[PDB]
Amino acid sequence: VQAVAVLKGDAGVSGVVKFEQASESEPTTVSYEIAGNSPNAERGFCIHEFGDATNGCVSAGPHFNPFKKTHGAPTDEVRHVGDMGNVKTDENGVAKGSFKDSLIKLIGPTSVVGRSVVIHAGQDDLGKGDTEESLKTGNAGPRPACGVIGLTN
């Protein structure tokens, strides 16, 4: 399977995020290319529950979290399925790279197809800040861009 999300908004940020998973027990390879960000920064990157774009990135809902855990880092045992942490932007505001993840899936009951990918205006505190918003969201701030994960070839 292959899925893709075109990130858009009215804040100068835009990008494309690709997903690929061969079989359900296999890890998904997420590849991203995102521009218009603040230079040399770290930005919260995550999958939200709804692929609803009726109201900007707002209608995307909360973090995709079928197992009802607290927000954490991609490498934490306890994290939301949709937690992809922070992407690093370069001298020109571009975030580009890829990684594999064992929780994010395109196949099965927790598939991310039809959900949203969101790029934040701030840095995710990886659930390590010591407030309650930390365990909820990671305090990454506003959602400048987002996109519904659709199927493709």
What's the one-letter identity of residue 6? V
Binding mask 65-104 for Zn ion (x = CB under 5 A): ------x--------x--x---------------------
118 contact, one of Zn ion, a second copy, Cu ion, none, CB 5-8 Å limit per kind: Cu ion
Q: Which residue in 35, 46, 57, 84 binds Cu ion (CB under 5 A)?
A: 46
71 contact, one of a second copy, Zn ion, Cu ion, none, CB 5-8 Å limit per kind: Zn ion
| 118 contributes a contact to Cu ion by CB under 5 A | yes
Instruction: Tell me the C-alpha distance between 99 and 137, whole Å.
Output: 21
- Per CB under 8 A, residues contacting a second copy are 3-4, 6, 16, 49-54, 59, 61, 113-116, 147-153
CB of 26 to Cu ion, least distance (A): 25
Instruction: Single out the residue of 128, 92, 113 nearest to residue 28, CA to CA.
Output: 113
Instruction: Tell me the C-alpha distance between 60 and 49, whole Å.
Output: 6
β-partners of residue 8 are 146
Instruction: Single out the residue of 67, 52, 66, 68 nearest to residue 116, CA to CA.
Output: 52
22 vs 67, beta carbon nearer Cu ion:
67
| 149 contributes a contact to Cu ion by CB under 5 A | no
**How, if at all, do strands 150-152 and 145-148 pair?**
unpaired
22 vs 151, beta carbon nearer Cu ion:
151
Instruction: Tell me the C-alpha distance between 29 and 135, whole Å.
Output: 25
> Footprint of Cu ion on this chain (CB under 5 A)?
46, 118
